[PDB]
Design an enzyme around this catalytic site. Structure first.
Site, PDB file in Angstrom:
ATOM      1  CG  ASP B 181      -1.980   1.087   1.214  1.00 35.30           C
ATOM      2  OD1 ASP B 181      -2.456   1.436   0.116  1.00 35.30           O
ATOM      3  OD2 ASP B 181      -2.340   1.521   2.326  1.00 35.30           O
ATOM      4  CG  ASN B 431       4.072  -4.537   6.985  1.00 39.96           C
ATOM      5  OD1 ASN B 431       3.779  -4.277   8.140  1.00 39.96           O
ATOM      6  ND2 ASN B 431       3.211  -4.383   5.953  1.00 39.96           N
ATOM      7  CD  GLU B 432      -0.304  -5.416   6.904  1.00 37.39           C
ATOM      8  OE1 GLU B 432      -0.480  -5.220   5.669  1.00 37.39           O
ATOM      9  OE2 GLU B 432      -0.942  -4.863   7.803  1.00 37.39           O
ATOM     10  CG  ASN B 490       0.394  -4.023  11.181  1.00 36.01           C
ATOM     11  OD1 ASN B 490       1.109  -3.610  12.109  1.00 36.01           O
ATOM     12  ND2 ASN B 490       0.850  -4.155   9.941  1.00 36.01           N
ATOM     13  CE1 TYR B 492      -4.075  -1.654   9.715  1.00 39.42           C
ATOM     14  CE2 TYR B 492      -4.993   0.546   9.937  1.00 39.42           C
ATOM     15  CZ  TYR B 492      -3.913  -0.280   9.660  1.00 39.42           C
ATOM     16  OH  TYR B 492      -2.729   0.307   9.348  1.00 39.42           O
ATOM     17  CE1 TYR B 496      -8.993  -0.696   4.875  1.00 38.51           C
ATOM     18  CE2 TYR B 496      -7.235  -1.151   6.453  1.00 38.51           C
ATOM     19  CZ  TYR B 496      -7.681  -0.523   5.314  1.00 38.51           C
ATOM     20  OH  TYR B 496      -6.795   0.250   4.591  1.00 38.51           O
ATOM     21  CD  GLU B 527       0.649  -1.018   9.416  1.00 33.75           C
ATOM     22  OE1 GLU B 527      -0.523  -1.055   8.931  1.00 33.75           O
ATOM     23  OE2 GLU B 527       1.661  -1.340   8.769  1.00 33.75           O
ATOM     24  CD1 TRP B 572      -1.359   2.953   7.981  1.00 31.80           C
ATOM     25  CD2 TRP B 572       0.774   2.582   8.620  1.00 31.80           C
ATOM     26  NE1 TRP B 572      -0.574   2.845   6.827  1.00 31.80           N
ATOM     27  CE2 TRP B 572       0.729   2.627   7.210  1.00 31.80           C
ATOM     28  CE3 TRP B 572       2.030   2.379   9.254  1.00 31.80           C
ATOM     29  CZ2 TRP B 572       1.856   2.456   6.414  1.00 31.80           C
ATOM     30  CZ3 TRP B 572       3.164   2.201   8.441  1.00 31.80           C
ATOM     31  CH2 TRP B 572       3.082   2.260   7.051  1.00 31.80           C
ATOM     32  CE  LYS B 591      -6.309   2.843   7.406  1.00 32.96           C
ATOM     33  NZ  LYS B 591      -6.129   2.815   5.897  1.00 32.96           N
TER      34      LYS B 591
HETATM   35  O1  LIG Z   1      -4.273  -0.393   4.955  1.00 33.64           O
HETATM   36  C1  LIG Z   1      -3.444   0.333   5.477  1.00 33.64           C
HETATM   37  O2  LIG Z   1      -3.670   1.604   5.657  1.00 33.64           O
HETATM   38  C2  LIG Z   1      -2.113  -0.207   5.957  1.00 33.64           C
HETATM   39  C3  LIG Z   1      -2.336  -1.673   6.347  1.00 33.64           C
HETATM   40  N1  LIG Z   1      -1.036  -2.248   6.763  1.00 33.64           N
HETATM   41  C4  LIG Z   1       0.036  -2.097   5.809  1.00 33.64           C
HETATM   42  C5  LIG Z   1       0.263  -0.641   5.458  1.00 33.64           C
HETATM   43  O3  LIG Z   1       1.290  -0.563   4.484  1.00 33.64           O
HETATM   44  C6  LIG Z   1      -1.055  -0.083   4.884  1.00 33.64           C
HETATM   45  O4  LIG Z   1      -0.814   1.244   4.436  1.00 33.64           O
END
Ligand SMILES: O=C(O)[C@H]1CNC[C@@H](O)[C@@H]1O
Ligand SMILES: O=C(O)[C@H]1CNC[C@@H](O)[C@@H]1O
Lengths: 620, 620
Positions: B181, B431-432, B490, B492, B496, B527, B572, B591
């Site tokens: 992203d 990452n992820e 991470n 959300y 999300y 994040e 994040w 964000k």
């Molecule tokens: O979806 C998002 O805003 C973040 C989710 N985790 C990874 C980030 O690079 C991404 O920008």
């Protein structure tokens, strides 16, 4: 069946009940019965007409689920109610309502976008009367428009495989989850009024049709002769009704006295020589005055109409025999404080913007609009596609008898309300239902919608074309859209797919246009567009920039201009509007060519220039 | 293996090659190799360092796929190359480069975020030299960071079932599709320089470690004694190197002469009494001066370092034996015109904003940053989690040996470049990546990542903790994250998923925290956040409003404050940044708690007040 808009004349008076009412929120599935029997305790103010959701910032009424209760008092002179039939009309209560007067239930209604009324002659009393209206906002798998019973709102994000999410969903506060892309604004969105008619015999309904035009002028402004038909329905109880036809200056140009025969009805035809026709961009309205006779008049009603024909012929859409090209957009009834509440200042402004843009049409996406907007478009020469609130539908709904009945009610109710408007040229029976797929799904959709297509034709005395607005889908397995009278497609090539790549988007569009080229039907866009934040700019515009929106229409419109059978371009949307919150909605839907405050983005100026050079008739 | 940053001193000179170079775009899969033999024809200007994508608005260089070619000339006095070893260093060429000097191919390199160098002693000549650098931006299923070979970019929209879309995809212009992203900014993102060392014998690498601290002060500002260790590597060819330890004032506080032994190395330990310790919020730096002896000095290098220990103990993260709490964010190297290009004005401003916010840390999401930023954070007392570009990975990559080798190269190269920074406290190896699911997938991911966890531990002389940053997933079938030294998640919830519903988001969060409570590791957010358009406001803030972003952190932070084992909050993002265009990215990722121009949104002010009240040590 008749729902004539209330009129004041020598025989009839209207008493509006708009203003600042009392209001309370209530429960998810109930409200206190005693609130209909006495003044509401500790009431909030609430203006009517208006959605309630944006009228209180101390409460979060956008999050409300279930019932609210409105109430007010009113009093009228006994002199004016004496001997009359007294009707209480709700132009719209969204979505369902229970109505009480002086502690008596009058009845209930489901259907948030069409009017209903009650005879209150016996429930009224002298002095102050107490009117209580409970309004339910809930939507789900049995409502039109459709809500989701679980999961997510339309185009919402989820992580459904995460155990914590699955568990939290079970205990989350109940919220309406629209299966449609606009906010679920609720309440008394349109006017409320008491009105009178004579009681012994009264006019209940009027239908005027243009039956035939003989020798239409080259410029379509007149015809040598127009044959119009009238059908008047009466209520109450050798009687007669006088029908006078008045032209635009009020001059009586025709008149007949017709016998009422037992539903008591009078019907007939009237020849209007040298008739002045209604056209996009050049409206002309007559009035049919119906007078129930006993020198005295027992009852009267004045029905506006316009003389014009609509006919689909091959791949053309003929108005008064001339090949029309639609220029316009889907709209919404949506504005900052009012929500879905009707606002005639805004309607007047929007019609002037339609003219500023050199557009000629719009669709009532995705529900019948307030009656005053159609009168305005009648006088201003703007064509309308009139649509029922059958949005969010899929196979789950097709198997549900209650949904099918609500769908037929909406179609019958929309056409009964709107049939006399010359500006309406086409009916839409749904927006973006599921039509495609494998197995029996395409046939199941077809078997659901074909009787509704037939019902729209049976209900409309003008027999206007009927369409169904089709979502972006696998057009090779959909067997329903191609059977409509006009093919109306929503396409987002380059936005929701092939994102940002206008070359590929135009290639994909042309592949599908090659499919429709062989179908033999007129085809038009009813939606296409790109979310655009005013003030976002780029030299090579990317998604959300004003430049990308302008480029989007420039590229796509160049492709449809090459297709002679493509008879209209209605984009999405006239103006930005509110939606349920989610990760793809930046303060709502931003595909407007105007901002929510009706200011023009770059693409609006580009479109205005394009549409200034496209004539209503004869472009193709 | 050593990549010491080029230094100028009495034995060494650095000659920068930054400036306005010549530039041409080339092909999708090729470039003209003869361009290295003569000046580029019809060149464009291109500033170095900097991404090339936003340096030319006449061309659409954001859309470019494949190769570009940079070139410049340079000349240095013969007096200063004479007798010297001549090294040409690229701090970063993104993603792959071929380097020519006077027509001769020096070699090639693949990682886009780590430095590489060539010995050009023999390719240089007197007068003007011609340096040509072909840079390849392409990403795909074999690169780190990962691209998609077909379909969409990360979180892109599609209508894959529409036949016209499937057909248009087959012919669409080739475009890099990030499986990550952030925008795929390419070019000479960091500095280029020619530098000299002595040729017969030279310092090649230096590693300083904090081996032990005795009797740390209550405030951690000093220790009664600190044991440090040095390891110096030499190139070239009874030899000796003098090691001097300089304190913050330049006073030589300790010093040793060590024997050089054959790969030519010198190593030992040095005791430092009353050592001043490096801490978050209270930096202190020493200098290790290494001087190669023959009175004269043959070669010298000055290595900054700080004296501190890092240790995970149970559910605590101990710096100098005190329980640390992370306050901060993921960042990006991203800014308006520079793209991913390094900008020391912006680094200096950003570190001041970290202080303004009362944050103490960040992660180098999702690639190693420019070396100068770590030097700044060393001096400013800001803790770093250092991360390799292994983003966008899933099972397709785990069986690809080219990917595995690039992943090992990045881990070794990052730690070799960055091991001496006291500000770095933890390494992140991905990452992820995909870690959960059923069948063999969780075990396949574990078998891929576990050798890399061990590689990071074996590469770092300080043996700092190693983590992997985990995407929102089914934590019950992920078997890899829970084996890291610190669990970095991470999440959300409420963005999300459970969108907008902060009560449900907190409930879901607490269910997952209950899972991690039983695992018994220290856990932190790396994040969490919510896209926010500055200037969007509401009294009950909905998604994309400034108020929602504030409420989001307020609610989530209240829940993690209740968990003693939750040792850090990195949100994040620090600031809004560019992404590939798509329907969920409004001019990029929003964000940021700061705008892309580093201005504070409402949530930044709220976080500043929260973080002002949270100490670096002993919060939990
Ligand atoms: O979806 C998002 O805003 C973040 C989710 N985790 C990874 C980030 O690079 C991404 O920008
Ligand atoms: O996605 C969109 O922008 C539109 C898709 N067609 C249906 C509209 O209600 C909706 O707003």
């Amino acid at each position: 069946n008749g729902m004539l808009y209330p009129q004041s004349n020598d025989s009839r008076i209207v008493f509006p009940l708009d203003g600042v009412w009392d209001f309370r929120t209530a429960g998810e599935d109930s409200y206190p019965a005693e609130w209909a029997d006495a003044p509401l305790p500790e009431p909030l103010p609430m203006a009517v007409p208006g959605s309630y959701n944006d009228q209180n910032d101390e409460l979060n009424l956008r999050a409300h689920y279930g019932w609210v209760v409105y109430q007010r008092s009113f009093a009228v002179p006994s002199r004016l109610v004496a001997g009359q039939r007294m009707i209480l009309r709700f132009d719209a209560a969204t979505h369902a309502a229970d109505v009480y007067l002086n502690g008596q239930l009058l009845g209930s209604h489901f259907g948030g976008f069409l009017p209903f009324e009650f005879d209150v002659t016996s429930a009224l009393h002298a002095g102050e009367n107490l009117l209580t209206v409970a309004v339910d906002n809930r939507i789900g798998s049995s409502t039109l428009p459709v809500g989701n019973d679980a999961g997510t709102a339309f185009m919402g994000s989820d992580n459904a495989n995460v155990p914590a999410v699955a568990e939290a969903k079970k205990h989350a506060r109940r919220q309406n989850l629209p299966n449609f892309d606009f906010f679920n604004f609720a309440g008394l969105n349109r006017h409320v009024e008491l009105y009178t008619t004579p009681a012994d015999a009264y006019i209940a309904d009027i239908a005027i049709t243009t039956e035939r035009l003989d020798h239409i002028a080259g410029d379509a402004c007149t015809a040598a002769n127009a044959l119009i038909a009238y059908d008047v329905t009466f209520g109450g109880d050798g009687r007669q009704v006088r029908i006078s036809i008045l032209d635009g200056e009020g001059t009586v140009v025709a008149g007949v006295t017709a016998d009422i025969e037992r539903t008591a009805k009078a019907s007939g035809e009237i020849a209007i020589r040298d008739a002045k026709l209604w056209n996009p961009g050049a409206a002309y309205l007559y009035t049919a005055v119906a007078e129930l006779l006993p020198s005295r008049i027992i009852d009267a009603y004045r029905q506006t109409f316009g003389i014009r024909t609509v006919e689909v012929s091959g791949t053309t859409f003929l108005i008064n025999g001339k090949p029309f090209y639609f220029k316009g957009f889907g709209k919404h009834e949506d504005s900052y404080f009012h929500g879905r509440g009707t606002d005639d200042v805004l309607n007047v402004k929007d019609v002037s913007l339609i003219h500023w843009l050199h557009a000629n049409s719009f669709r009532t996406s995705h529900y019948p609009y307030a009656e005053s907007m159609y009168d305005l478009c009648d006088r201003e020469g703007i064509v309308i596609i009139d649509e029922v609130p059958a949005v969010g539908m899929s196979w789950l709904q097709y198997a549900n008898p209650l949904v099918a009945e609500r769908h037929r009610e909406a179609i019958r109710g929309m056409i009964a309300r709107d049939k006399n408007h010359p500006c309406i040229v086409m009916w839409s029976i749904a927006n973006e239902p599921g039509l495609d797929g494998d197995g029996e799904r395409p046939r199941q959709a077809y078997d659901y919608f074909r009787p509704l297509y037939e019902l729209a034709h049976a209900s409309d005395p003008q027999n206007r074309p009927v369409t169904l607005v089709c979502c972006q889908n696998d057009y090779t397995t959909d067997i329903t859209e191609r059977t409509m009278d006009v093919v109306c497609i929503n396409r987002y090539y380059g936005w929701y797919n092939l994102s940002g790549d206008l070359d590929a988007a135009c290639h994909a569009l042309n592949i599908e246009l090659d499919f429709w080229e062989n179908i033999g039907k007129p085809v038009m866009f009813t939606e296409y567009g790109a979310d655009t934040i005013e003030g976002i700019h780029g030299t090579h515009g990317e998604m959300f920039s004003e430049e990308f929106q302008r480029d989007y229409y420039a590229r796509i419109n160049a492709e449809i201009d090459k297709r002679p059978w493509f008879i209209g371009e209605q984009l999405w949307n006239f103006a930005d509007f509110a939606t349920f919150q989610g990760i793809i909605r930046v303060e709502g839907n931003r595909k407007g060519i105007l901002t929510r405050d009706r200011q023009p983005k770059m693409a609006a100026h580009w479109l205005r220039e394009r549409w200034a050079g496209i004539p209503d008739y004869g472009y193709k």
